[PDB]
Symmetry: D2
Subunit: 356 residues, 4 copies
């Protein structure tokens, strides 16, 4: 197959560098165009910095979808990587015109925009991929499989967290990290959240947005058990760089995974010794392998994870010219995300009331 | 100093073997008496087993207390290891007749008795000590100290948990929820103001909760109103006995896991995170006083228990005391009981915040 | 069963540990003791331990004889003196039929170690060597599984023991032995020959504070195994890090004493398994030396107490499950320390 | 600024060098000699989408034609097995083409001595892919000891066990050796080895124990130890190294590469992390994402490719480090000194 002609909006900036890495890694893409800043001097510079044909460097995402859709050489797919109050204005321009969009988390900035974009995205024939990179890890996907086959039986408990420390001093945590924890939660567990209760705080004086969240969680009944969970996210917890973690408890055993040591999945069958499952090592399931690149003991990590999303989206894109083993996060996952955030905010404002 | 003559009620069962080791370990106590059972056939079997003078093996704590108070050679303190509904009953007899009581947790089974049992201990001139064994660990006491000095600044978050997996196939809140609550309040040194809970009885036929999820709001302090979470559970395959506490403040954070009780993870904001060790570099006075062997030689669960017996020993010698002596009181016990009550009250009300 | 009357010569951290290891299981009661040479310290300590002053001696020789006569006389004695005072103190109690629990290592000199093995053979009282570290339940699970061929035939037996305390009689004899002895206890193998490079890193220090040692074991289940041993007193970051890893044809095992309740077992071509004290897949040999449920950490003392109790059990006799470190163990221990010091002085020569 | 046209010889682990190369966008891969049989070569040029103009079946030819081209590769990646290294590399070195070669240097001490000749002659760079020297913490570890953060070095304890074959000293022993030297800042002086081939029918070794003696440095005459092994179940890829000095200690395991364990004697042990607090400049330059976002084994590999790149750009920075022909040589010597010493029942060799 011919590499996918890829554009970018936003970037210039870790998150730009990450997406561009994610797309070089498995060599499924070539990055040929970009509107990476709204103020032209900066755009032109950034293109200059990436080696982009200046023919091919814009400063208007709207201008850039119009021309590129005409171009015979035009982009086949676009990574949207603006701040999220702009995800919707941007993606609808490309989806509108048959260009696949690979969008960064969370979906939007408001529930209103989330709903519109779904509609846009649903109307289009172009693919729409949401980049929840953490569902991308081999061991995270193995968990999903294991649980789907009932390796720990009915789910009773889903315990989820995501503390960081970077705002100890000096849109909030629920929307930025909280949603990842939530989405990681449902992805692994196979459950639907039915209702939640949230206590949010902005600890850091001067700060209007929530920088910590405690959330009680009630799940829809699957398999005769009505699962519960909790969720914590925080940006004021010294000692934590990026400690996303998920813990699942069934009627037959448990599964523990920590993003910071991603190559490990802790599996304990009830009545048995806990077993340490490894990426690419024994016990590694099919679903894990399909996104593994190197031998056991040879640490894959965050970028390899992000790339897993770009590679699946690719396998799908090709099939727009589809393998049922291909997974990636959808507009409905992002749909769910925004409902989650809205409801946390509504809850805490209503003093911890249950919301669905 | 002449040893402490000690009696027991109940045990004679893990629980009783543990207090007996906890008493023996530091050599502060000779165990001389005991109502080890309600049926006399056992009570004598138990006594003969513990190698006790049958003169001194009873089968009725009330008799046992009446007799030992007047007995001149008689027990100076007693350890109550019965089930919770019995504590108040058992304990009132001994505090009446002025002998000291080392009680197992929780205080009671009902709020009403706990209420009584405070009035008994408040009236008495004897000591009441409660075995929140887990507050006996040196790193747990070092955390309490560092947070008390200002080491991590004003406390913002207390994250508590306690999962076991034995009941996968009297409930979790009262059995283990308390230990966790107590650990949280012990280390962070804060007063819980209000809570909201969601309690589940996952197992079919099990009436009592076997899981709890609890949101915590603490009394403002250092100009900061902290919040927290508590999970406990008996149905979580993977956890044998995983009590844990994590504490975040304006200046840094501290984490302690009871399965590896000999370590304390201290990270000051902006700085590499440090590994704090029992009896090692960076060990503080509070830990030092309750440590017996050098760094690297693991202390543990029996030793955290023994620390509570010995802290109590110290206070007992002072009644024939150092400001350094600390042990869980009746009030700690009471808090524990208001806590369980409020969880159960809140949860019936669909997580209403309760004071 | 009447508690064993025990007396003590010597002891100091080390005296305190033994008295705890005595008290823990309620098997023993401390009646007599000669805790010092100077009679002033020896009255005082007795006074503190609340012993009977009638029972406080200041010479171990007067102690054996007197106690040996008495009908309230001690049924056993804990020897916790320095190394060069072991043989002297112990023989006096074995002569007269009172049991001896001696700390490690056996003696300060190989020659005395030979004399003592003799005194112990002749004698009809038991001789327990407190190689405490062999008392951990998870250390005994290790021995139980390897014996049964759970990890097939042993190929490698990697041992070490760094400490950091002398960063500013040396490590081999002091800690090197503990780990030689642990490797053997666990594998079931007999050392054939070694080759060793020792250092006295710190200026002014005469004794070696580090040791690297190559190892060869006797053929056994067909395979002729090897191993290495590092010990040290100058490795910052280590407090008391004894550790042992054994690899076979079928699997491998790792145990570290700083986190003693865990034993890492991986069977070949299968996911590694975290075995725990009192937990699922706690083997028999583990259970019989465990007090409390899983997840409730047991430690140094409990293990030390394990020895004391197995000593108890032997004394009450003897259940052929009751194992403890023998005189011959302490003997192999000396020969090892001997060979190493020999081997280094001849620049790494293999010795046996 | 303009990418570096790149060739490769081998592959068809080639994938890893290809990943390493793409990762930072410094190279474009244009030509290749991915196999000896001329069809398997075309096919693989085809799997990768190389212009068939530029798919070769013999390296010597490839080198020639490319050196002539105006589209000629500016660098070649030699990823063939060891015994082919020299043949290939000398053809690109001869003609001004930089060569990034995978380890080890060669399969004979003879061959090696010749490559150093070809390398030293050439004006093209010779880069040896010691990926593990690539990791940010491993460079942080080197920097600190350079800086005397743990005082004079006394111990260098290093091991590398794997489990898959339940020739070792050459396949993994050397990585362990070089990494210890890389981090430690020392020169091995002499070693005594005891090598082993447990598994029947295996001619080569699959275990090695070896004591080590370095050359007096800062008044201290360090010692170390080294174990590698391919028959040690439980171990996937257990490369690890620990260094103890007069004032401190450093520990690092490659299976959890983002953590460096620093103990300052007398003080509590510290967990140092990639891009985290207390990360150091040597680490900074080679890290791509924030603390807590784990970089790994490919990232370490792409770090060597990205320092070669920087080296190349010049020859068109005293910060830019990479493993040289010499590191390669020291390695060939090491392995020889081993086998030699073992055969002589563990004799100290130099």
């Amino acid at each position: 197959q011919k590499r996918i002609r890829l554009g970018m909006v936003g970037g210039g900036a870790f998150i730009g560098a990450v997406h561009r890495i994610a797309a070089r890694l498995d060599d499924h893409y070539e990055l040929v165009a970009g509107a990476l800043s709204s103020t032209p001097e900066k755009a032109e510079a950034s293109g200059r910095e990436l080696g982009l044909d200046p023919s091919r460097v814009y400063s208007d995402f709207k201008e850039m979808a119009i021309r590129e859709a005409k171009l015979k050489n035009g982009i086949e797919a676009v990574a949207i990587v603006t701040p999220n109050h702009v995800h919707y204005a941007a993606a609808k321009e490309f989806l509108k015109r048959g260009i696949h969009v690979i969008c960064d988390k969370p979906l939007t900035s408001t529930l209103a925009d989330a709903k519109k974009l779904k509609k846009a995205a649903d109307e289009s024939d172009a693919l729409f991929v949401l980049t929840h990179n953490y569902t991308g890890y081999p061991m995270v996907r193995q968990a999903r499989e294991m649980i789907e086959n009932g390796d720990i039986g009915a789910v009773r408990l889903v315990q989820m967290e995501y503390p960081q420390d970077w705002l100890t001093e000096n849109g909030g945590s629920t929307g930025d990290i909280g949603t990842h924890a939530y989405n990681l939660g449902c992805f692994v567990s196979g459950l639907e959240l039915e209702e939640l209760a949230a206590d949010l705080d902005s600890f850091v004086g001067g700060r209007q947005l929530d920088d910590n969240a405690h959330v009680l969680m009630r799940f829809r009944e699957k398999d005769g058990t009505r699962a519960k969970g909790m969720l914590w996210c925080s940006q004021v917890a010294p000692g934590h760089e990026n400690g996303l973690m998920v813990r699942v408890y069934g009627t037959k055993g448990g599964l523990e995974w920590t993003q910071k040591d991603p190559n490990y999945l802790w599996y304990t069958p009830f009545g048995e010794p806990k077993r340490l499952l490894t990426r690419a090592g024994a016990g590694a399931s099919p679903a894990a392998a399909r996104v593994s690149r190197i031998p056991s003991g040879h640490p894959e990590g965050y970028l390899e994870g992000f790339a897993n999303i770009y590679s699946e989206a690719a396998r799908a894109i090709y099939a727009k010219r589809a393998d049922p083993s291909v997974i990636y996060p959808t507009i409905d996952d992002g749909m769910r995300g925004m409902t989650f955030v809205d409801a946390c905010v509504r809850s805490s404002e209503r003093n911890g009331a249950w919301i669905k």
